[PDB]
Amino acid sequence: ANLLTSLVRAHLDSGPSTAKLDYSKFQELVLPKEDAGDVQQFYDLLSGSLEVIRKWAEKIPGFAELSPADQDLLLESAFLELFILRLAYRSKPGEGKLIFCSGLVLHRLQCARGFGDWIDSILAFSRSLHSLLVDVPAFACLSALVLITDRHGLQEPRRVEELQNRIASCLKEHVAAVSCLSRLLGKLPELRTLCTQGLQRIFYLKLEDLVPPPPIIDKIFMDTLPF
């Protein structure tokens, strides 16, 4: 298919229109470590992608045909990595500009306190991703592949594999219709590492306990700790 087309439409609909960007809070300069407002903003930014990613996923053909327990596991396990990857692709690392799925635009310095060093690691991944010049159809497949992947505790792991195989096929085909490929999906391993830095940041913040995580983020955190 045609799957490609559904994948592209799912992606485009899950993000702001360039016309939809909000720069009312954007400030490149900052007068002059984290306080409770930085922490609450960190949780709010994360939180805003929760509903968005879920709706995006439901539009990936075959995802809603996975068991509902496998759907939830897949979503929870991939959430950070998806948040990071969609953010890296959407943002403008050359200007330190972060663009969130709501359309809100923030400078790196405005998020640094809440995010810690992770934001710099994310911006480094974003420059690298931008160097590959991943076109929208390739990215629509790649982001899907982050979600539809093997995980521990899947009820029907072969079906997840089948759907993954379908999306990988579609991607590889689109790449021909235009080495590059292996380069492209070598990004997925780096993405997992960045997910780890995110879990590390949430741990520190829970440790610190200025503002507690909201229940859904907290659950993602606890569920994804292999111990």
Q: Which residues have a Cβ under 8 Å from the Cβ of 135 and sit 6 or more positions away?
A: 178
Residues after which the chain is broken (C–N above 2.5 A) are: 32, 178
Are 142 and 185 spatial neighbours (Cβ–Cβ below 8 Å)? yes
CA distances from 54 to 136, 152, 173, 223 (A): 20, 20, 27, 17
Neighbour tally for 154: CB within 10 Å: 19
- Between 3-13 and 157-176, two packed helices, what is the crossing angle to 10 degrees? 90
d(CA 193, CA 197): 7
Q: Which residue range forms the structural domain that includes residue 89?
A: 1-227
d(CA 142, CA 11): 11
What are φ and ψ of residue 62, in 5° steps?
Answer: 95, -20
The residue among 138, 124, 131 whose CA lies nearest residue 197 is: 124
Are 20 and 103 spatial neighbours (Cβ–Cβ below 8 Å)? yes
d(CA 191, CA 197): 10
SS3 209: coil
- Cross-strand pairs, 92: 97
Q: Which tokens sit at 54? A: 């879920």
d(CA 102, CA 21): 8
d(CA 181, CA 158): 24
Are 97 and 27 spatial neighbours (Cβ–Cβ below 8 Å)? no
CATH of the domain at 137: 1.10.565.10
d(CA 40, CA 53): 20
Unique residue bearing structure tokens 């991943």: 134
What are φ and ψ of residue 22, in 5° steps?
Answer: -115, 110
Q: Which residues have a Cβ under 8 Å from the Cβ of 128 and sit 6 or more positions away?
A: 187, 190
Give one DSSP letter per residue of 5-27, joined into a string. HHHHHHHHHTS--GGG-B-TT--
CA distances from 5 to 10, 63, 78, 137, 144 (A): 9, 15, 22, 8, 13
Neighbour tally for 219: CB within 10 Å: 12
Nominal resolution (angstroms): 2.2
Are 221 and 212 spatial neighbours (Cβ–Cβ below 8 Å)? no
User: Residue ranges of the alpha helices (H) in 59-135?
Assistant: 68-90, 108-115, 118-132
d(CA 158, CA 109): 44
Q: Count how many domains the chain has.
A: 1
The residue among 56, 227, 20, 46 whose CA lies nearest residue 139 is: 56
Please give the DSSP secondary-structure letter assigned to residue 65: G
Q: Which helix (H) or strand (E) holds 98?
A: strand 97-99
CA distances from 133 to 71, 96, 156 (A): 30, 18, 35
Residues in the chain: 227
Please give the DSSP secondary-structure letter assigned to residue 97: E
- The distance of Cα 93 from the centroid of its chain, to the nearest Å, equals 16
d(CA 53, CA 81): 11
SS3 99: strand
Q: Which residues have a Cβ under 8 Å from the Cβ of 194 and sit 6 or more positions away?
A: 81, 84, 118, 121, 122, 125
